Amino acid sequence: NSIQIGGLFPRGADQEYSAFRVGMVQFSTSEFRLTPHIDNLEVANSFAVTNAFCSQFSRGVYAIFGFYDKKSVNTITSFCGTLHVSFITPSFPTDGTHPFVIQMRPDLKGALLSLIEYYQWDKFAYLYDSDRGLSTLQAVLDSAAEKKWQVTAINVGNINNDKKDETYRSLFQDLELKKERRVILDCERDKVNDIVDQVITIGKHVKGYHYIIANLGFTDGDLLKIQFGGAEVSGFQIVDYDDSLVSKFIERWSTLEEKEYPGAHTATIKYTSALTYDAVQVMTEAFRNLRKQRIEISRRGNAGDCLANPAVPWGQGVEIERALKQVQVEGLSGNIKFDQNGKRINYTINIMELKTNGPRKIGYWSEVDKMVLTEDDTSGLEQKTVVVTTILES
Amino acid sequence: NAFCSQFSRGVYAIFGFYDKKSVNTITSFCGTLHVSFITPSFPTDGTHPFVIQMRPDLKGALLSLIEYYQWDKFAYLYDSDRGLSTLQAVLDSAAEKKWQVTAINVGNINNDKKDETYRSLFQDLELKKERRVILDCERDKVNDIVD
Amino acid sequence: QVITIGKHVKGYHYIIANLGFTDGDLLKIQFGGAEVSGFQIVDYDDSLVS
Numbered sequence: 133n134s135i136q137i138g139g140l141f142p143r144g145a146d147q148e149y150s151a152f153r154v155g156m157v158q159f160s161t162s163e164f165r166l167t168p169h170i171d172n173l174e175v176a177n178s179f180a181v182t183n184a185f186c187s188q189f190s191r192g193v194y195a196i197f198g199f200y201d202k203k204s205v206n207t208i209t210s211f212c213g214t215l216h217v218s219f220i221t222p223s224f225p226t227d228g229t230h231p232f233v234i235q236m237r238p239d240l241k242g243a244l245l246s247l248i249e250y251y252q253w254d255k256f257a258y259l260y261d262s263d264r265g266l267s268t269l270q271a272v273l274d275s276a277a278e279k280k281w282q283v284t285a286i287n288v289g290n291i292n293n294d295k296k297d298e299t300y301r302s303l304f305q306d307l308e309l310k311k312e313r314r315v316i317l318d319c320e321r322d323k324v325n326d327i328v329d330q331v332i333t334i335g336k337h338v339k340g341y342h343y344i345i346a347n348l349g350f351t352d353g354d355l356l357k358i359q360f361g362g363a364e365v366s367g368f369q370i371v372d373y374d375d376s377l378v379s380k381f382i383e384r385w386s387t388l389e390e391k392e393y394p395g396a397h398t399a400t401i402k403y404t405s406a407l408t409y410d411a412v413q414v415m416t417e418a419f420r421n422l423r424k425q426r427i428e429i430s431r432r433g434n435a436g437d438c439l440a441n442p443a444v445p446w447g448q449g450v451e452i453e454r455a456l457k458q459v460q461v462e463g464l465s466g467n468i469k470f471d472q473n474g475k476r477i478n479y480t481i482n483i484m485e486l487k488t489n490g491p492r493k494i495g496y497w498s499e500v501d502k503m504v505l506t507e508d509d510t511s512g513l514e515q516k517t518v519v520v521t522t523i524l525e526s
Numbered sequence: 527n528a529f530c531s532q533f534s535r536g537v538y539a540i541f542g543f544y545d546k547k548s549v550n551t552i553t554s555f556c557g558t559l560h561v562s563f564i565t566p567s568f569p570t571d572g573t574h575p576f577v578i579q580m581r582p583d584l585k586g587a588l589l590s591l592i593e594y595y596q597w598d599k600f601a602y603l604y605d606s607d608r609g610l611s612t613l614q615a616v617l618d619s620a621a622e623k624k625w626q627v628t629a630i631n632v633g634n635i636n637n638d639k640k641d642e643t644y645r646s647l648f649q650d651l652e653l654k655k656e657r658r659v660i661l662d663c664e665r666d667k668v669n670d671i672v673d
Numbered sequence: 674q675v676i677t678i679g680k681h682v683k684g685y686h687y688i689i690a691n692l693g694f695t696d697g698d699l700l701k702i703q704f705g706g707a708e709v710s711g712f713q714i715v716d717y718d719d720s721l722v723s
């Protein structure tokens with residue numbers, strides 16, 4: 133049983149591919165083997181993505197795992213919908229209901245808005261990056277109307293990096309007109325470190341400031357720098373290293389040879405990579421539920437040209453979708469479940485705060501229970517008041 | 527398909543339209559295949575070669591008009607159809623010129639029950655007693671709002 | 674260490690008691706805010722040194 137699948141990995145996704153390989157090994161069975169056809173292309177380039185898709189389609193694949201950018205996302209969602217091809221991706225969730233797309237990344241929009249109310253914020257700065265779509269930006273802006281917030285949104289993305297200093301100085305110059313002390317960083321693991329470094333340089337990392345890293349990888353970045361500064365830093369973590377499941381994964385991951393497995397000799401793992409590993413498990417359980425369900429879907433490498441007109445969708449694809457979307461297993465990113473569209477449901481996102489001793493989970497966020505705080509209260513706080521005795525005498 | 531079809535037919539230039547979703551496809555192919563693409567649609571957010579845009583950039587004219595009326599606090603109802611290029615414009619300028627902009631995506635409003643949404647829309651535009659609104663929409667979405 | 678604990682912001686004043694003020698890296702505590710003074714024996718403004 134040889135199931136051929138496509139793999140679209142953006143140049144530079146070393147740890148992601150390394151995690152993709154480890155998944156192939158951990159979830160390899162005798163019942164059937166997955167044959168990944170890897171294609172390293174510039175994910176941003178829409179044209180290239182189109183070729184890589186039609187190429188993997190002519191090779192006759194049953195499913196495709198890859199990534200997309202804010203620019204190429206429309207290409208994938210469109211083709212996969214027309215050709216009834218299933219596309220599994222750890223990338224940011226699609227802004228809508230696009231069929232034949234499985235998204236490993238849970239929606240953070242909800243967890244973010246809940247955290248803001250927890251700290252009871254009414255006026256804050258929102259530094260965003262247009263890389264993962266303004267889906268979360270619209271979220272905070274729309275909620276700013278209802279909850280009545282004074283949000284200062286600033287696109288920290290289009291900043292040219294070969295002279296990006298007179299821009300940051302002019303950035304926190306506007307964030308001083310209103311004396312902004314509460315900032316939300318909605319950026320990638322990289323753009324965050326750049327900002328964090330600048331923050332320390334200008335000294336805006338001392339007590340009084342409060343930063344919120346708007347990503348699923350709070351511990352993915354270096355925090356040792358703004359850890360002793362004084363400013364409170366909060367964020368979100370999807371990979372709970374306290375789970376015996378994840379703890380066991382790291383035990384083998386941290387030992388792997390960094391030569392064969394690039395950027396894999398660490399005690400931690402980027403949430404993007406962790407989702408890639410969980411993606412393999414989903415594809416395995418999906419193709420397995422098709423064998424046990426007595427469903428024939430097999431074909432050959434003659435699907436033909438994807439530009440074929442009229443384009444006829446192979447009916448066997450409809451079943452492959454109902455398989456992946458029906459999958460429900462336990463992975464590094466907590467309980468994995470899907471709806472009819474492909475968006476993850478019944479998941480859990482741990483809310484993190486950065487203390488002196490390091491990061492610490494102060495609670496979690498459920499799509500049905502909102503935010504729920506867990507034990508951690510430093511009870512008490514010198515509450516030991518003073519007992520004053522007195523007599524009733526006018 | 528329509529692009530590759532017209533390309534196989536051996537054309538010298540292509541005139542058409544694109545959406546916020548298909549725009550990347552056109553700009554990419556036309557750049558790779560060195561095919562010229564003339565379009566009246568919204569200008570591309572960047573410098574994409576082999577693309578001729580008939581529509582001038584309104585971003586500039588809008589910002590200038592705001593200062594003319596001397597606006598400091600206004601509501602900005604936008605539609606994600608023509609890209610948030612102008613939205614980013616007013617938001618970025620809101621930092622410099624110090625404006626209190628209330629941006630609201632009036633696009634994702636489902637039209638088969640779009641009434642309890644408008645009532646809840648001007649309910650938020652009443653918390654701050656917004657009297658100055660900017661409608662960044664198509665000729666159609668504008669009439670709906672105006673009505 | 675000063676930068677780490679954040680004692681390099683406005684309000685602090687350091688004096689480097691050596692003849693090599695520009696000999697060390699100052700780009701780090703340069704934008705901090707705290708005033709830093711010192712001593713220089715090698716004048717790079719002299720045509721001789723230049």
Ligand SMILES: *[C@@H]1O[C@H](CO)[C@@H](O)[C@H](O)[C@H]1NC(C)=O
Pocket residue numbers: 467478
């Ligand atoms: C929802 O998720 C929880 C936590 O993983 C799980 O225990 C439960 O079975 C799920 N609910 C259903 C009905 O699938």
